[PDB]
Design a binder for this molecule. Structure first.
Ligand SMILES: [Zn+2]
Length: 610
């Protein structure tokens, strides 16, 4: 399997990167060492002070990783397992560093270490994919690294705010990012537990990990895309980036100092920088080993690969189904030539879809995997770039054509949208994911200004346009203004009546929207109808309310008589309290003559009742 990368910065930059990387390695050495201590005993497993130190190393590795390729120009032709990230990162809407994009992949450091000449024999590992023990929401951690966010990466487990961890969703709400339906589904699990592993998120949603994750860019769909959407909209805090670079090297010393102290809880001899420098390779070789077991065991239980092949893959791909699952068939067979295609299609869902649901050849599917990794990766790419690749001879016809048909199918599925209107939209706005996002942001004029995009298109594309526009008198401009101001139909429906008037809605329009025509019979004006619609569900409910309650913060006793349909004869004798109660209980009045003659002891000798 091929890893490689070439440096293109100046000689100063070369040394800057070497020092950062080597400090990342030193930081990651602490992560390995602390993981080692944690499984010396179940007592060590549950040492929270040890866990806090483990986490501190994770943080510092992140910070150092964020600093790789600060100017986003120092590396080129970054190959990880044969796939060239230079070209892919360039096609993303937010571009960025091929180096850091590489580092977010397991064993991506391999590629970067070659460009910085750090000899692979010393295993200069930097990994930034911790899940269960990560002090930040794991996907966030990874996206911060890809976007080089030295500033946002905390350098201390104390410094980690809830909004980047246990209450991560707060951070999402602060930046008014559009969330699609896949993502809202993913959040529902992350809300239960932000440290749910991705293959679990995928298994419950009935998706591949690639689908759960998406591309690491705003214009995709998935937890990575979501976090990118948020993170890019956070101002770079150049100040705090300075604090973090200034402080972290000595914090690392201090972490290593704390590692000695703690290690004496579980070991005869301290765990020192020299010790980890010596055992690093051995520690890593052993973890790889029990991950080959666990993983090769899963390749049989879940996917059903013949035992001897399942171990081959397990070894070849560092014990990672994520890794295996995103590897092309040609590369998979290169290292395990015993493997069969139905077996490859079992673990690599992208390969499976491309073959079985788009009739692609394995070579052609490999081509698309290599360039884009997943379907999400195809949909993150501008249509016209895919055309360019086809024309420039860097993409075969069958791959190219499948790519087009995937992009078009995301829009033609939406009733009203034909192929040339879909095709046009992709030209106007780049890719299908970016088209959808404009619809969720309610950019109705922007979309409409494309040929073939009519009311029927707008209906099926823009959430809540269907609802507002089907009310007479509400024009397109208004529908956009309303949707944008309040955040979608449901939120517009929830708006106050006073402020909807200010927005220029006729009272008829407001009445239909909240569907309180029946309540406005019962009560004079719109506003009180709405007040009554909030607390109580319907008119139906308001009538049933106790006589005291209606009377209280309400209006007349005659009005309460009319509201509950209390007959003249029953109203003329008893007081309301007991009249509306007898009616509630028996319904007719003929029936009211079920209870005995002068059990009707209340008021006059009203004989017409018996
Ligand atoms: Zn800080």
């Amino acid at each position: 399997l091929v890893y490689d990368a070439e440096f293109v910065g100046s000689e100063r930059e070369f040394e800057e990167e070497r020092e950062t990387f080597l400090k990342g390695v030193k930081a990651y050495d602490g992560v390995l060492a602390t993981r080692y201590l944690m499984e010396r005993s179940s007592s060590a497993k549950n040492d929270e002070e040890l866990l806090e130190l483990h986490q501190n190393f994770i943080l510092l590795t992140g910070s150092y990783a964020c600093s790789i390729d600060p100017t986003e120009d120092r590396y080129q032709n970054v190959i990880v397992r044969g796939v060239n990230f230079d070209e892919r990162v360039q096609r993303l809407s937010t571009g960025g560093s091929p180096a850091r994009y590489a580092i977010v992949y397991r064993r991506g450091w391999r590629a970067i270490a070659k460009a910085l000449d750090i000899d692979e024999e010393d295993v200069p590992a930097i990994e930034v994919r911790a899940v269960k023990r990560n002090p930040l929401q794991p996907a966030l951690y990874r996206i911060l690294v890809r976007y080089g966010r030295v500033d946002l990466m905390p350098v201390t487990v104390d410094e980690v705010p809830p909004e980047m961890a246990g209450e991560f969703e707060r951070l999402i709400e602060r930046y008014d990012v559009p969330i699609d339906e896949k993502e809202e589904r993913i959040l529902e699990i992350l809300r239960e537990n932000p440290w749910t592993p991705h293959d679990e998120i995928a298994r419950r949603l009935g998706l591949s990990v690639s689908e759960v994750e998406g591309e690491k860019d705003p214009e995709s769909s998935g937890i990575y895309s979501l976090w990118s959407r948020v993170v890019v909209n956070i101002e770079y805090d150049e100040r705090t980036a300075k604090r973090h670079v200034k402080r972290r090297d000595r914090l690392l010393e201090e972490l290593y100092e704390h590692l000695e102290e703690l290690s004496e809880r579980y070991l005869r001899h301290p765990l020192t920088r020299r010790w980890i420098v010596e055992h690093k390779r051995d520690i890593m070789r052993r973890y790889l080993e029990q991950r080959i077991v666990e993983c090769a065991l899963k390749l049989q239980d879940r996917y059903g690969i013949r035992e001897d092949v399942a171990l081959c893959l397990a070894r070849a791909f560092d014990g990672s189904i994520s890794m295996i699952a995103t590897t092309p068939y040609r590369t998979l067979k290169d290292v395990c030539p015993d493997l069969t295609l139905e077996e490859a299609k079992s673990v690599n869902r992208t390969l499976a879809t491309l073959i079985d649901e788009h009739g692609l050849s394995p070579d052609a599917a490999d081509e698309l995997i290599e360039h884009f990794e997943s379907i999400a990766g195809i949909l993150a790419t501008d249509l016209e770039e895919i055309e360019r690749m086809y024309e420039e001879g860097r993409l075969s016809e069958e791959a190219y054509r499948a790519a087009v048909e995937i992009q078009l199918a995301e829009l033609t599925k939406k009733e009203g949208v034909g192929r040339k209107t879909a095709e046009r939209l992709l030209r106007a706005f780049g890719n299908p994911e970016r088209v959808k996002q404009l619809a969720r942001e309610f950019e109705i004029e922007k979309l409409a200004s494309v040929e073939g995009v009519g009311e029927r298109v707008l209906r099926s594309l823009v959430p809540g346009y269907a609802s507002l526009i089907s009310i007479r008198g509400i024009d397109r401009e208004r529908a956009e203004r309303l949707l944008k101001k309040y955040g979608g139909y449901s939120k517009v429906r929830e708006a106050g009546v006073e402020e909807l008037r200010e927005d220029g809605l006729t009272d008829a329009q407001i009445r239909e929207l909240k569907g309180l025509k029946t309540l406005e019979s019962i009560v004079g004006d719109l506003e009180k109808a709405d007040e009554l619609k909030r607390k109580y569900g319907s008119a139906s409910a308001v009538r049933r309310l106790p006589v005291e309650e209606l009377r209280e913060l309400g209006f007349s006793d005659d009005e309460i008589a009319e509201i509950k349909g209390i007959p003249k004869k029953l109203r003329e004798a008893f007081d309301l309290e007991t009249a509306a109660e007898l009616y509630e209980r028996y319904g007719s009045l003929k029936e009211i003559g079920r209870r005995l003659s002068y059990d009707d002891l209340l008021e006059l000798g009203a004989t017409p009742k018996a």
